[PDB]
């Protein structure tokens, strides 16, 4: 949005990036940042379901990444000009160091899940994957 | 009009005002017209004394800053352009500026002439006179203004 | 019955410093707020000019929505669209209290009574109805 | 078909990929905050702020152009610190067309601001014309203090200081009043360069009179003896003038003093 | 409003006013439209240089009744016959109409006192009455002229965006 | 709240027909209509008695000063 | 060179000299044509050679001479 | 900075100082390699920190107190003697040796440009320190 | 650079001056002290100190002769 | 329960903020209550049924979870 | 501490040191305390004479360049910031700077006051005295330093 000021009479916001539509996400790991990113926009994406919204169907929990090696981040919301959340999701993922994909929830049949975990190429993480 | 009548009166009495002399920034406290003694007056103070004879007062010393904000004038032609064909469209009483930094001014009179004081800088003894515009057309600078009394205050 | 009246009022503009040069406000400038209770929009109908050496300017506004929602309280309209950086604050000094809903049943009934009583011409009530039938005149 | 459902954009089919993430070209932004210690700013996009990382001023910031900077053979560093202003429009060019890496190329003012800070009345004309050269050729600059400096292709050259004090020079007899000293001298208002473009006087920020001085001294010279000769050209706010020559070690002085009275 | 003008200068102080006299001058002019830029420019210059402003300085800048405080609360409304009575004093002899030089002086004095000394004041509306009054020599065919002044005073961007949304 | 009360009273003064006395009962019932519980009581100093208006008089203008107890 | 506004409100800045016939580098906004901005002004080799008095053909800047 | 030719024909311009080892931004013509043009010169963070005398860590430029220090056109010539200007009345220029030229108006800043006894020392000026 | 003299554009002699004045100072009294260092085209030097309100002046003048 | 001087930044623009610090440590952060703590609380509640007693006022003031001492 | 004891002694003897006068850069060769005759001394030389009475010597004239590299001090608060709430945290003996260019300095004493010489520039006759910090808080400049003798040499 180009031409919105959002001023107040003799009142201001101490934190910068206010009045405008700027939103800043901060966190020391992908699961902390991703939770803020998804939680910001998920509940307001309303639909005409007779029963709920995407949050009930999509768990998007049990997320992890390299917390120790990653420092505090200040990823911006508008990093991509008029881009989709998927485009902004890619920046948070920081591929190929983390894998992201949509798959069925085996632990909870009947609903989907969003997965964001460190890459399984590590030795111990490779052993963690279930064998078929 | 007031300005045209004043200009015509000055032109008629131009020969009789030899007592008035030229100086760079002469600002005497004595009216030149109310005294036979010679007195040194510049163009700005000359205009002030001419317009003070009537009911209008204006202000003193009436430097270049007077025209900027007092609202007594409205510009006819702006500075930076210089057309010799449009000179005939002017009317008597219009103020003519001179110099690159508004050093001197003048009053326009018909037949392509103007009334001003010209002479050497260090307090020349030459009296007021009228000069042709052809030689001084180079330093005209294009700025022209006009008076208005009916709407002011 | 006659339709409702759009709300309108005055909005004050405060600049950081007096304008050095004349500025032109584009027509159709949108004035809104940020409070969730009053998301109704406003727009100007005529051109306006901000002369230099003027630290404030007031311009009339009209409520696009036809209803009582335009009767916002004091200090509600605090947003301007297409505003330059010179603007420091936007505020309305007084509440509108001019917007109205559709014509009230009691007022319509009273005016109908005036019309019915005014059928017999050449009387005080006939002249009263003839004077009051114009929308602009009142009382 | 079924496989076509992927990331796409535009009326014509195009495969959206990492190329679209890269920013093509240059963009504008406004200065919101300046790190004075490092003189590196953070610019605000219309709905985003570049920089402003966890690092305060040093580790991460947006550099700014400099007139010149370098180091001497002895090792001492030299350079310039051009003035930085909040709210100004600055052109930005990303490195390798990669976002999150801005560098300010230059600073560009608004049309109104440019119109206000120029005294040229001409609307247009070729620069080669002699008459246009008088007004077009003017290196007109204003310091952060409202007192300004002025140069021109002609001999006129005007400099200003605190209050109405000024320095001027000229050669043409027509421009003689600009730098004259008859009676009380030319007034500050008489100069045409002392007015903004929109018929407004250029008020000095500080009206108090200044006090100048030209102190001259050294350490040694080719003769090898130490330098101990001190001279000054001090001028007071009250109008006094003092030209003096001193020799501190020998405890001798000769002064030519002028009082305000 | 001599007291208010002096109080405003004392509120900011000489030190603050000295920095930006041209723009601090606009603040006083914006608050009170009675003072033009030149009038308010000169008084501030006198205030800072001298350090104070007296009644002599205020009247010298512009002619005003400094010794008049009753106008702050209430003042005459100029109801109908007040305009007729005051105009009679200004135009007492017929030579004023013939002699235009004193006519300009007379009308300016009337407008100066009329707009300042009464609740309702206007320049263009009052000027229209004076022009009619002068033309009819102060005896118009109807009395509405005296009361005429009293009654008078109490897209392409949008179209393209709209149609583009419609399509 | 003071500004809201002032604006409400000023609006009540306007939009008033001609040839009606300045009734105070309707004024207090109108201003009290904003909130019966929050607003406790209203009193007046000089205009307690109704002001009879002539046929050609209309009560539109007026300066309002709120003196909260 | 620099431009801005003081806390009092007065505007300040610079008006660097502009010359006709000079070569100027241009950078379009967002790589979109019909939106030029001049980045800087660069002179011809002959002009640069004429307006310098350095007789040295080359050498490292760190040398004292 | 600027270059051109007068109506008479004589050429005029500027020769801004050039330094070895400095970092310069480059923009290729038409995004075609082997055609560089230098846009500007940018110094290192340490170099910028060394050649400024502003002690403030941050703050809005509109503040009056910040205007005293933020508004400072501080420049150093290739010679170590420097030139200094400020939004306030202070303005300092230096030459060979300890000789200098200064001016000021405020009584608080009077010692900066005084001539009492032997005059102010070059070390007393705060602008004379990195 | 190309073994050519840098002719000045204007050959007429200039006339310099250093006019110093103010408005007020911390004492609060108005500033009325005016001094100049005027230099004429003919080589004259005039250093003067003035007080316009009191109508007093002291001048140190040098003639071209 | 971070140590002293652990919070350094606001994790936002912080245009008008230089730095942020805490002069005191955090101690209210505690894990779930153990069985013994619940037993003591229940014994206090049982003994607190008789109001107008110091032991009853102890439980009355301690009913808020935040209060410890 | 040495600095606190010296500051307390100066405060106790402040009334008896009327002989010491104020000057811009007074650097007399005679110790003010060892002579009844009046002598003109500035703040820097006053501090030098105060610290020279004990075993410490420091250096002469102890200008602003002394604090930069001698290592006799460690900064408590840097220049450029000015907080009125943190003033109470200071202790007696801390050196307080004044002026935009380190024109003058002072010694802090309890109860929100400081000891320094204030007067007109051209060699004022006013003696040393103590002034409230409220009026001079504007020109405090935020710079604060402290002494240390145990580790030096």
PDB file of C-alpha atoms in Angstrom, chain E residues 1 14 21 30-31 33-34 43 52 62 64 72 83 94 96 111 129 139 154 159 162:
ATOM      1  CA  UNK E   1      -4.754  42.060  20.275  1.00  0.00           C
ATOM      2  CA  UNK E  14      13.801  35.813  22.048  1.00  0.00           C
ATOM      3  CA  UNK E  21      12.068  34.627  12.284  1.00  0.00           C
ATOM      4  CA  UNK E  30      -1.755  32.021  10.675  1.00  0.00           C
ATOM      5  CA  UNK E  31      -3.331  32.483  14.112  1.00  0.00           C
ATOM      6  CA  UNK E  33      -5.373  36.890   9.722  1.00  0.00           C
ATOM      7  CA  UNK E  34      -5.499  40.608  10.599  1.00  0.00           C
ATOM      8  CA  UNK E  43       7.358  43.674  14.666  1.00  0.00           C
ATOM      9  CA  UNK E  52      10.661  44.582  24.013  1.00  0.00           C
ATOM     10  CA  UNK E  62      -0.219  49.630  11.755  1.00  0.00           C
ATOM     11  CA  UNK E  64      -4.980  50.231  15.653  1.00  0.00           C
ATOM     12  CA  UNK E  72     -12.584  41.185  23.219  1.00  0.00           C
ATOM     13  CA  UNK E  83     -24.479  51.079   8.596  1.00  0.00           C
ATOM     14  CA  UNK E  94     -20.884  65.766  -2.652  1.00  0.00           C
ATOM     15  CA  UNK E  96     -16.131  63.269  -2.493  1.00  0.00           C
ATOM     16  CA  UNK E 111     -13.731  49.480   5.478  1.00  0.00           C
ATOM     17  CA  UNK E 129     -22.017  47.958  -1.523  1.00  0.00           C
ATOM     18  CA  UNK E 139     -29.433  57.828  -2.934  1.00  0.00           C
ATOM     19  CA  UNK E 154     -23.998  35.134   7.491  1.00  0.00           C
ATOM     20  CA  UNK E 159     -12.524   5.861 -13.484  1.00  0.00           C
ATOM     21  CA  UNK E 162     -13.173   1.385 -11.031  1.00  0.00           C
TER      22      UNK E 162
END
